[PDB]
């Protein structure tokens, strides 16, 4: 078959699957099929029988609405994705959801859909390849060597996150990143000139990318020539601008947004088959086409060759090879359990009153000696977030290439989605920090990490009005509660240096999802814990101060407000009242405990509960109920020194005691 | 005094005010003082005695950490901002908070701090000036004509939102937008080459801006020359790239991130004074420097000249002039109360089972006939969000310049912060739509509108698993609850075309803060309402179905789930149980009602409550407590037809009734 005939197999599988589903986007798959045929058949290094081969090239479909493009490519080249799977497009519990989801189909490298995060994940994947190569490759043993390929569209380039990711990609000289731009002059609102008129070539040249302009996206020889010059450029990422016709082959809907996101219809599909010269019924692919699309034989030989290279590498570098396999698998070092425990116990036995952001740095310093896979960073806030340790080596294009730290610049969304790509790639545990407030810039990347069950460590410092004079644009109020609502994210707001080391430990051990670690600017007093209390911190909430017998009142506190809760409990106790203090470093972790443990912390029979947190109050009714009270925030902050703000907003022993006594008096 | 001596007044006030607070950022004010002297003394058209002069130029400090720069300028040029105010920098209730706040000091045009949003607000103000000029100017009567000036630094240019805002600004040809880039090679991590190496000039030329390269930021003559060329360019926004030395004047910390964000120290301040030849004690500005900095005489003449132009305009176009004054003040038209009421009563009388996104478009259509100040838009989703009405005139650089709609492209964050600038400018009520999921892209701009108490209307469609097959990356679950947590935002989730029209009405009428209006893709059944029920919808929650006497079970539902709550209540009432259905289209609005009203709707003695909402369940404990139940979500969605998703996730009458019996 001809290259165009092979590409048409994608076009027809796409429009037939959308039609059977009565749902989906036929246009971009049809527009990009010729580019896909060249890239997948001539260049992409992959093995359909092992989609987890460590040295495979990574392909990312950033215009994720064109999901039938990747589904067709995976089916045609030999992956474990069947015609029956394509017939279940957009159906409940199928392998082929409306937007491609990591973990659902073999060979989908990332979950896309939200525009701009695809290319940003890919930037992270290319950073991880370059850094892993810098850490593990040796002379004669280039065991890390693979490209990162991206398809992207107009929406992706309009999104601000594309500017964050691609500006950084150029600075870091990601020569193995090659992106194909689907330049079809179409978005949902119509022909894009009215709202999108960048000179995109000049924009990307300004980032330090190589740009190959004006490629005919339906001419295989041109796509091939451009890909060759893209691969020959070793120092810069490359953008190949492909001129395509959206919905190529449709006589009445091509070149128009009418083909972007609706079924073509039975009549138009017939007219398309004829304009394409495609004579086979829906979901029928001739055996000849499967034979020429198959990547099984080329892929198996590529991996067997890499396995032989790795075998020889392991003889020369036995510890590197073991570390490679360990880190790529995501397992922790065998001494991790004992050294992290010993560090946490040392802190419990050597009290220090420090800011939890300092405790965070101390934890990084200790754990980084055990975890060479740490790949840390900050969005231009290293000296405020305290993310550097004594062994930090900031990565640059030609310096510290096997380093372990990224100066992300002022790019919270880009950093967060890059970290997702780093986590997806394997070999690293990424962490990256900013101020808690600017979680809101990166919000959807955090949710994406949770949806993809990726171990990405989101570090946030300056967590409340405790930060003081920078004022209400910076002082978080509702941000912690908002992070707590993200399914499959575990949010930690530790109350001293010990809870801070335990939150880091729990985040590192959480391999099926991300964590958010929230730290303070101001000093926090360390709480006393018995061995059993120390063991219970990782359960998310535990009894910190207890009375003899059933409590008449329970204080629930997190983070910097735990000392206040303890002091108010002391005052009430000196009046003969029986009060319990529960510290709740992670509401998410506590919610997962069995009902016996939760009842032992918050007994159902004790309904007089006071929650204390310098955050939005509405969150806490889940734990205090109608008979409880929340000592929280219900407004934006103010610019003033922190001690005056804590008094202004009621975080005083007098106020807490007074509010507690009101519910004890049933008022 | 020389120009440099006048600029040094900014430098010494900045560093002395930061030193007294023991907090703040001296470097950028010190780095930009010469630029600010030129722009404010030679070019800025403004009146310190009336910071609300409608035709004033707009200045925006996008690198807002340098707040002492704008406070010094305001103090020096004669605004109502005193030395005593600068002495209260960063102190409780001062007019000089650590980042400039709109309304806290006269002459501050927007609240900055979150990097990138200042320039994006300024793109919004430049769009509003251009569009308002297109609507109101007449031959011989150019009553709208003013520039938008921005200071911005490396952080702003690194942020993705700057790419959204400046791309659109070039496309719309905002010739009166002029930005000065504080190109000082410094950010908090240090010298920026290791993480920021853009060819910024070529980047902005790719957006269609004019770029003046390599201006010496400490040479008043070059700054003046660059600004003249920026003003001469009428068709494109201009970026003036000013090479500056952060902390200019400090011998030990200039050109270093050491001067970015901490007091210089008493000793370093003394050496800086010596290096600058500055001989006056802290907070002492000689009378001669005040006289030469004063904008009072120039500004009063400029406003008087404009008042005379407006008087001539009002003589020729009395109705137009009265519309200008009404729309700039923010007051609604006199017939608004009656027209909106008649529209809502008409919908209650002619039931239709339509998607609330279609109900939203119908409301836009009816209200836009009454509100010429509407400036609508969508982030590349006009056909899905349904934001166009029959009178929509999409604004372009040279077409529909007096239009009323913006194709924002795929730029949710930039859209939202541009809308904030449009609201700050005056003359418009901006609304803008995207899918509910992608408010997470625009999150902090929504918060900033609430912080600034701006009437910005954030429209969201496709609000639940109800959108169906696009799957869990698009299906909101926790987004509505997160919107509800934002102080001073009112979030509405209406259950039918009638609640949809009332939600738009209340958002339009809310002058002191923003609204989020959340609409469905799937059809919603209209509910029966008496005249008193119809009137109570604007109280945020109300009794929709009531039993006789005290109920033993209260259903609380919102949006698309109210019909399910009605259906389950009818099944339970047919069994003899006393059940009430409460529709709660806005939790935030309801929370602000007086105690008597709230008790009338949710009596405290009825503790058996079931909340129903296709969103994160944990939010609703505030209203149901320990002994209630939530028919909610606690996971991500799935890619499948909507009808199957509602069954899969338990949004069925049988499931709701089962959970109601668990507490009865
Ligand atoms: C952040 C975000 N905003 C909006 C959308 C909705 N959306 C999906 S595709 C699309 C149009 C973008 O067009 P383009 O990328 O050029 O694709 P084409 O129509 O050419 O296939 C939009 C707005 C989204 N997926 N993500
Ligand atoms: C979105 C956002 N992220 C982070 C910050 C914190 N921050 C304030 S200033 C700054 C450094 C930016 O440097 P630049 O704008 O070049 O300022 P300079 O030091 O030159 O005055 C950062 C990261 C912020 N205000 N907003
Ligand atoms: Mg397109
Ligand atoms: Mg700078």
From Swiss-Prot, chain B:
- Protein's job: Catalyzes the reversible transfer of a two-carbon ketol group from sedoheptulose-7-phosphate to glyceraldehyde-3-phosphate, producing xylulose-5-phosphate and ribose-5-phosphate. Catalyzes the transfer of a two-carbon ketol group from a ketose donor to an aldose acceptor, via a covalent intermediate with the cofactor thiamine pyrophosphate.
What top-tier enzyme class does this entry carry?
transferase
Question: Which of this chain's residues are annotated to bind substrate?
Answer: 25, 260, 357, 384, 462, 470, 521
Active-site residues annotated for this sequence: 412 (proton donor)
Which CDD domains does the entry mention? TPP_PYR_DXS_TK_like (cd07033), TPP_TK (cd02012)
Which keywords does UniProt give here?
A: Calcium, Magnesium, Metal-binding, Thiamine pyrophosphate, Transferase
Annotated Mg(2+) binding lies at 154, 184, 186
Site annotation (Important for catalytic activity): which residues?
25, 260
Q: Subunit info?
A: Homodimer.
Q: Which organism is it from?
A: Haemophilus influenzae (strain ATCC 51907 / DSM 11121 / KW20 / Rd)
**Matches recorded under PROSITE patterns:** TRANSKETOLASE_1, TRANSKETOLASE_2
Any Gene Ontology CC annotation: cytosol
Single GO BP term: pentose-phosphate shunt
Positions annotated to bind thiamine diphosphate:
65, 113-115, 155, 184, 260, 438
Q: Which Pfam families match?
A: Transket_pyr, Transketolase_C_1, Transketolase_N
Extract the InterPro entries matched here.
THDP-binding, Transketo_C/PFOR_II, Transketolase-like_C_2, Transketolase-like_Pyr-bd, Transketolase_bac-like, Transketolase_BS, Transketolase_CS, Transketolase_fam
Q: Can you provide one Gene Ontology molecular function annotated for this UniProt record?
A: transketolase activity
Look up keyword Metal-binding and say if it applies: yes
EC number of this enzyme: 2.2.1.1
Query: What does the cofactor field's note say?
Result: Binds 1 Mg(2+) ion per subunit. Can also utilize other divalent metal cations, such as Ca(2+), Mn(2+) and Co(2+).
Q: Which reaction does it catalyse?
A: D-sedoheptulose 7-phosphate + D-glyceraldehyde 3-phosphate = aldehydo-D-ribose 5-phosphate + D-xylulose 5-phosphate
What family does the Swiss-Prot or TrEMBL record give for this protein? Answer: Belongs to the transketolase family.
Q: Which gene encodes it?
A: tktA
Cofactor(s) recorded for this entry are: Mg(2+); Ca(2+); Mn(2+); Co(2+)
Q: What is this protein's record name? A: Transketolase
């Amino acid at each position: 078959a001809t290259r165009r005939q092979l590409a048409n197999a994608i076009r027809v599988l796409a429009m037939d699957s959308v039609q059977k589903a009565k749902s989906g986007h036929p246009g971009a798959p049809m527009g990009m099929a010729d580019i896909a045929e060249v890239l997948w058949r001539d260049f992409l290094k992959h093995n359909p029988t092992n989609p987890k081969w460590a040295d495979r090239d990574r392909f990312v479909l950033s215009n994720g609405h064109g999901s039938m493009l990747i589904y067709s490519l995976l089916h045609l080249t030999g992956y474990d994705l069947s015609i029956e799977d394509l017939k279940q497009f957009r159906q409940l519990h199928s392998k082929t959801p409306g937007h491609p989801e990591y973990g659902y189909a073999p060979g989908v490298e990332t979950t896309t859909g939200p525009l701009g995060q695809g290319i940003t994940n890919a930037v992270g994947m290319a950073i991880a390849e370059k850094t892993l190569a810098g850490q593990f490759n040796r002379e004669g043993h280039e065991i890390v060597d693979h490209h990162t390929y991206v398809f992207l569209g107009d929406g992706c380039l309009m999104e601000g996150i594309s500017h964050e990711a691609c500006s950084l990609a150029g600075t870091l000289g990601l020569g193995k990143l090659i992106a194909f731009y689907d330049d079809n002059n179409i978005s949902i609102d119509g022909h894009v000139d009215g709202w999108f008129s960048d000179d995109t070539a000049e924009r990307f040249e300004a980032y330090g990318w190589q740009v190959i302009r004006n490629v005919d996206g339906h001419d295989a020889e041109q796509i091939r020539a451009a890909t060759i010059l893209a691969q020959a450029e070793k120092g810069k990422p490359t953008l190949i601008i492909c001129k395509t016709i959206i919905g190529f082959g449709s006589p009445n809907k091509s070149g128009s947004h009418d083909s972007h996101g609706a079924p073509l219809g039975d009549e138009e599909i017939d007219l398309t088959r004829k304009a394409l010269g495609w004579e086979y019924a829906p979901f029928e692919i001739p055996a000849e086409y499967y034979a020429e699309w198959s990547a099984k034989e080329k892929g198996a030989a590529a991996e067997k060759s890499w396995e032989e290279k790795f075998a020889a590498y392991a003889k020369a570098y036995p510890e590197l090879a073991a570390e490679f396999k360990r880190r790529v698998s995501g397992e922790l070092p065998t001494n991790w359990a004992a050294e992290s425990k010993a560090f946490i116990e040392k802190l419990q036995a050597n009290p220090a009153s420090i800011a939890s952001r300092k405790a965070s740095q101390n934890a990084i310093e200790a754990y980084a000696h055990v975890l060479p896979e740490f790949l840390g960073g900050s969005a231009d806030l290293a000296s405020s977030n305290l993310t550097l340790w004594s062994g930090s080596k900031p990565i640059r294009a030609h310096e510290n290439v096997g380093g372990n730290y990224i100066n992300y610049g002022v790019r919270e969304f880009g950093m967060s989605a890059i970290m997702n790509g780093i986590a997806l790639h394997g070999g690293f545990i990424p962490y990256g920090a900013t101020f808690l407030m600017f979680y809101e810039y990166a919000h959807n990347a955090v949710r994406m990490a949770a949806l993809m069950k990726q171990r990405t460590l989101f570090v946030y410092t300056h967590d409340s009005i405790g930060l003081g004079e920078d004022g209400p644009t910076h002082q978080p109020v509702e941000q912690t509660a908002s992070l707590r609502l993200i399914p499959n994210l575990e949010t930690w707001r530790p109350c001293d240096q010990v809870e801070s080391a335990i939150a880091w430990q729990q985040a590192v051990e959480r391999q099926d999802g991300p964590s958010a670690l929230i730290f303070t600017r101001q000093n926090l007093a360390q709480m006393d814990r018995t061995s059993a209390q120390l063991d219970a911190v990782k359960r998310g909430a535990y009894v910190l101060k207890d009375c003899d017998g059933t409590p008449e009142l329970i204080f629930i506190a997190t983070g910097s407000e735990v000392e206040l809760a303890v002091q108010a409990a002391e005052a009430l106790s000196a009046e003969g009242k029986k009060v319990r203090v529960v510290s709740m470093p992670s509401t998410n972790r506590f919610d997962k405990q069995d009902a016996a443990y939760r009842e032992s912390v918050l007994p159902a029979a004790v309904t007089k509960r006071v929650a204390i947190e310098a955050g939005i109050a509405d969150f806490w009714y889940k734990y205090v109920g109608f008979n409880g009270r929340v000592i929280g925030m219900n407004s934006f902050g103010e610019s003033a020194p922190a001690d005056q703000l804590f008094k202004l907003f009621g975080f005083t022993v007098e106020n807490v005691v007074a509010k507690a006594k009101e519910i004890l008096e049933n008022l």
